[PDB]
Design a protein around this ligand. Structure first.
Ligand SMILES: [Mg+2]
Ligand SMILES: [Mg+2]
Ligand SMILES: [Mg+2]
Ligand SMILES: [Mg+2]
Ligand SMILES: [Mg+2]
Ligand SMILES: [Mg+2]
Ligand SMILES: [Mg+2]
Ligand SMILES: [Mg+2]
Ligand SMILES: [Mg+2]
Ligand SMILES: [Mg+2]
Ligand SMILES: [Mg+2]
Ligand SMILES: [Mg+2]
Ligand SMILES: [Mg+2]
Ligand SMILES: [Mg+2]
Ligand SMILES: [Mg+2]
Ligand SMILES: [Mg+2]
Ligand SMILES: [Mg+2]
Ligand SMILES: [Mg+2]
Ligand SMILES: [Mg+2]
Ligand SMILES: [Mg+2]
Ligand SMILES: [Mg+2]
Ligand SMILES: [Mg+2]
Ligand SMILES: [Mg+2]
Ligand SMILES: [Mg+2]
Ligand SMILES: [Mg+2]
Ligand SMILES: [Mg+2]
Ligand SMILES: [Mg+2]
Ligand SMILES: [Mg+2]
Ligand SMILES: [Mg+2]
Ligand SMILES: [Mg+2]
Ligand SMILES: [Mg+2]
Ligand SMILES: [Mg+2]
Ligand SMILES: [Mg+2]
Ligand SMILES: [Mg+2]
Ligand SMILES: [Mg+2]
Ligand SMILES: [Mg+2]
Ligand SMILES: [Mg+2]
Ligand SMILES: [Mg+2]
Ligand SMILES: [Mg+2]
Ligand SMILES: [Mg+2]
Ligand SMILES: [Mg+2]
Ligand SMILES: [Mg+2]
Ligand SMILES: [Mg+2]
Ligand SMILES: [Mg+2]
Ligand SMILES: [Mg+2]
Ligand SMILES: [Mg+2]
Ligand SMILES: [Mg+2]
Ligand SMILES: [Mg+2]
Ligand SMILES: [Mg+2]
Ligand SMILES: [Mg+2]
Ligand SMILES: [Mg+2]
Ligand SMILES: [Mg+2]
Ligand SMILES: [Mg+2]
Ligand SMILES: [Mg+2]
Ligand SMILES: [Mg+2]
Lengths: 49, 48, 102, 145, 116, 112
RNA sequence: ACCGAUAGUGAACAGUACCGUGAGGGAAAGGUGAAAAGCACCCCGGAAGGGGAGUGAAAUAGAACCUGAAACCGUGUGCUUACAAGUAGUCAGAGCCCGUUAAUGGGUGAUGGCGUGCCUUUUGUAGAAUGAACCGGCGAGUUACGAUUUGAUGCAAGGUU
RNA sequence: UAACUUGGGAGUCAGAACAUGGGUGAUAAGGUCCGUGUUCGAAAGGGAAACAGCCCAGACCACCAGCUAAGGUCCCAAAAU
RNA sequence: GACAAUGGUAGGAGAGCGUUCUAAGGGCGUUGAAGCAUGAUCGUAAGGACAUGUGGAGCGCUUAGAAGUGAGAAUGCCGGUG
């Protein structure tokens, strides 16, 4: 190839999900968490088992 | 005791339509000089 | 002198010499289009077609395949984080009626 | 927005009619007249300008009622003072100021807009068979009953 | 690397301010209140493009009903008998004939009137 | 032509100077001097000092006839404020604005 | 494949002004021009400020000195308004002015129809439930190490440091 | 025209009115507790004067084109004095 | 070419617009860059060009990579203004 024309193999890359940036992305306000309770707090959730 | 809303620019400007000032009397000093005030004495810049 | 034709899904009232604005036909510029459904002819002699005058074409010449002015479609729901926005330009054709029949 | 006639000033013609009110019931006279003043019998009716024309009612003291609604059917009124409710019966208004009996019935059938107020000023009502408006040359008009 | 939020925020806010010319007073200068009005005026326009097809159909019928009663016909019995005669002309076209050519309108009244 | 003169950073507040300034615009210069000597506002000898300066520029820099001149424009713009404080009661202070003004009048003979 | 003056050291000019009896806490504040050539001289004015003139490529580059947004304050104007009940617009529509990235153009708007803001929390809010005076800047799912599942690639009873 | 199995990723555990079958209560409550359906929630549009839950009916976008539903046809206000 | 589908909150999936920086290639600029202002322009959306005024020295495009990557609300912090 050349250093100004290179392309990766097809299906190797995806852009990652940024969460919490406005309404139309689908993960805008509550950022996937749902509304309240212990699982919606930072560092929340409970230990496995 | 305190205003519930701000007052807009139009309502402020409609309020001070009478907040004006008037022109004075302005007679003349007939003998020698510029204009004086009416029923007054032309002392300075005046001979009446 | 006076005709009512049927084009698109709607009806137009024409006189020979004027310009009309119709939903998009499939002709080219400078071509001659002929209209086939005529519902009523007035003027000096009156013909009333039921539904059609059975004859009575209208010829016209074609100018300016075009697109309309852009409108913006916008809606939103009130407390719910949802809205959409999109544009639209509707196509049209311009024609000039030049000759009438009966 | 192809092609639809819209009326205008320098475009409309207003004329003058005369209705006589004897032997007519109050509401059935008034519903006929209020469509004249709006112009809903013109073929060139347009909702945002004042087409429609002038009406004169000349007898107005021979308006009939049906039933017992000349001793009933009171008309109320409030003066925006405490306890200032006032009233008069319908038979009372007939013998005393009958012109205001008819013109209140007709203006209640007109819309309350700016144009609806201006259309209601084209009504002229008189008790007894004479009217001053001979200069405007009005016509007779029979009610399509 | 640090990216500072330069020049992209004005450009977004100005074309909302510019999209609100002619609005009263504070609603054409301040961004938070002009945005909130431009959302409202887009919602109104969607609603009113649908009612415009209702308003004009109501205006056409009113004029046909006035023109038919000069020939002792209702609106109802005109367009009943006009259907049985086989005529398929609009309300819009039928309203324009009655204004322009009264003599032609009186002729299709008779073809509807004898079809009953 | 036109002559002008400005006076920058005048300590009087701009609302107070625009009252007397509205009496003199549109009038010819001989009346405007007579008005400013007879209104007893505090702004009046400051405007009158400025209108003298603009008349003297028309005679010297431009060689106009001072007998027939008219005041085209007269206006006052804001300058920078001085921010002071005042102690009120129970340990609390309040802010006080010392306003300033830029005064501009132009004068012309009405011809080209 | 670190920041570029609300950043980056608290500090590009300071552990100073300042606060505190004291241990102690703790800021704000960069940019004329290539060169100072930094406005001789005249005029108004008590001065401050200014108009000319002159320097300079440029002085709406004059020291409060690069560029100079918005809120906000004003001066002129083309169209409109003193019988009218309002979430301020929107759709229709005369009349009056103008003439574009030249296209079924632009500004204003007599009159008519329709129409109870935004976010958050809620069974449910125009809501007399919460929050926001306005403008501007800053301001919130990251990284390291392990695990597990997808996709891609190489080799294959071998693969890999 | 769906169903089922395996695996990755969730949110939900405050519900409301209407009709109907029943307890409780006073054959009281826009009451409270269970069952069966619809709608709201998360659904605009037309009607019910106005009115989340009632009747009709499920909005990809233009159109100054037509047929109908529930409800309606003296004027306000479209259609039969 | 026909046929069908396309309201939507918690929420799952997919495609994309823009910002700063780096590599490579290829370009623009004192015959006026970036920024600022105005405009009756183009695109399905986020958004992209052109002209004219100000301004007085740096900046786009293509492909790929990497992130302090997008604000209207937190009795948010700091400054200006009412
Ligand atoms: Mg994605
Ligand atoms: Mg969602
Ligand atoms: Mg939000
Ligand atoms: Mg989740
Ligand atoms: Mg929350
Ligand atoms: Mg909960
Ligand atoms: Mg939860
Ligand atoms: Mg914590
Ligand atoms: Mg004023
Ligand atoms: Mg940087
Ligand atoms: Mg920001
Ligand atoms: Mg319809
Ligand atoms: Mg002083
Ligand atoms: Mg004290
Ligand atoms: Mg610092
Ligand atoms: Mg800076
Ligand atoms: Mg000390
Ligand atoms: Mg600091
Ligand atoms: Mg000096
Ligand atoms: Mg400049
Ligand atoms: Mg400054
Ligand atoms: Mg420089
Ligand atoms: Mg500057
Ligand atoms: Mg008036
Ligand atoms: Mg209304
Ligand atoms: Mg509650
Ligand atoms: Mg509130
Ligand atoms: Mg209130
Ligand atoms: Mg508050
Ligand atoms: Mg803010
Ligand atoms: Mg793997
Ligand atoms: Mg493999
Ligand atoms: Mg449970
Ligand atoms: Mg429960
Ligand atoms: Mg209950
Ligand atoms: Mg009950
Ligand atoms: Mg149940
Ligand atoms: Mg909920
Ligand atoms: Mg459903
Ligand atoms: Mg509904
Ligand atoms: Mg309704
Ligand atoms: Mg009811
Ligand atoms: Mg609703
Ligand atoms: Mg029908
Ligand atoms: Mg029926
Ligand atoms: Mg009404
Ligand atoms: Mg009717
Ligand atoms: Mg659908
Ligand atoms: Mg959908
Ligand atoms: Mg996802
Ligand atoms: Mg230039
Ligand atoms: Mg840059
Ligand atoms: Mg340089
Ligand atoms: Mg950020
Ligand atoms: Mg805030």
């Amino acid at each position: 190839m050349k250093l100004h024309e290179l392309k990766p193999a097809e299906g190797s890359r995806k852009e990652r999900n940024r969460v919490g940036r406005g309404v139309a992305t689908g993960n805008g306000k509550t950022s996937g968490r749902g509304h309240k309770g212990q699982k919606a707090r930072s560092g929340g959730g409970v230990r496995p088992g | 005791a305190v205003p519930k809303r701000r007052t807009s620019k139009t309502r402020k400007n409609k309020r001070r339509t009478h907040f004006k000032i008037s022109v004075p009397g302005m007679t003349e000093c007939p003998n020698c000089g510029e204009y004086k005030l009416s029923h007054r004495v032309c002392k300075n810049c005046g001979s009446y | 002198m006076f005709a009512i034709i049927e084009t698109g899904g709607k009806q137009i009232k024409v006189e020979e010499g004027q310009e009309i604005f119709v939903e998009k036909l499939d002709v080219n510029e400078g071509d001659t289009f002929t209209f086939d459904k005529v519902l009523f002819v007035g003027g000096d002699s009156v013909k009333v077609g039921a539904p059609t005058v059975e004859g009575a074409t209208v010829t016209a010449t074609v100018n300016k395949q075009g697109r309309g002015k852009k409108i913006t479609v916008f809606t939103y729901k009130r407390r719910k984080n949802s809205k959409r926005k999109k544009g639209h330009r509707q196509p049209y054709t311009k024609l000039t009626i030049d000759k009438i029949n009966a | 927005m192809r092609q639809t006639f819209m009326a205008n000033e320098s475009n409309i013609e207003r004329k003058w009619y005369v209705i006589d009110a004897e032997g007519q019931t109050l509401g059935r006279l008034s519903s006929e007249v209020a469509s004249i003043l709006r112009g809903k019998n013109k073929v060139t009716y347009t909702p945002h300008v004042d087409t429609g024309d002038y009406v004169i009612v000349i007898n107005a003291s021979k308006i009939e009622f049906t039933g017992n609604k000349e001793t009933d059917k009171v008309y109320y009124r409030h003066s925006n003072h405490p306890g200032g409710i006032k009233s008069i019966t319908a038979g009372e208004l007939r013998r005393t100021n009958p012109e205001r009996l008819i013109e209140n019935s007709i203006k209640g059938m007109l819309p309350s807009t700016r144009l609806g107020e201006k259309q209601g000023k084209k009504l002229f009502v008189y008790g007894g068979a004479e009217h001053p408006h001979a200069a405007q040359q009005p016509e007779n008009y029979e009610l399509r009953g | 690397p640090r990216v500072k939020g330069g020049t992209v925020t004005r450009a977004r806010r100005k074309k909302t301010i510019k999209l609100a010319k002619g609005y009263f007073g504070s609603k054409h200068t301040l961004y938070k209140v002009a945005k909130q009005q431009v959302m409202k005026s887009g919602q109104y326009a969607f609603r009113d493009r649908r009612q415009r097809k209702r308003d004009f159909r109501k205006l056409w019928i009113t004029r046909i009903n006035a023109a038919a009663r000069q020939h002792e016909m209702s609106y109802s019995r005109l367009m009943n008998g006009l259907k049985k005669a086989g005529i398929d002309i609009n309300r819009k076209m039928l309203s324009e004939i009655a204004i322009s050519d009264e003599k032609a309108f009186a002729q299709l009244v008779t073809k509807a009137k004898d079809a009953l | 032509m036109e002559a002008k003169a400005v006076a920058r950073t005048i300590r009087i507040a701009p609302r107070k100077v625009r009252l007397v300034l509205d009496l003199i615009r549109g009038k010819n210069a001989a009346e405007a001097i007579a008005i400013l000597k007879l209104t007893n506002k505090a702004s009046s000898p400051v405007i009158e000092k400025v209108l003298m300066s603009a008349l003297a520029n028309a005679e010297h820099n431009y060689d106009m006839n001072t007998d027939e001149l008219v005041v085209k424009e007269a206006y006052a713009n804001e300058g920078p404020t001085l921010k002071r404080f005042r102690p009120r009661a129970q340990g609390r202070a309040s802010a006080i604005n010392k306003r300033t003004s830029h005064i501009t009048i132009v004068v012309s003979d009405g011809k080209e």
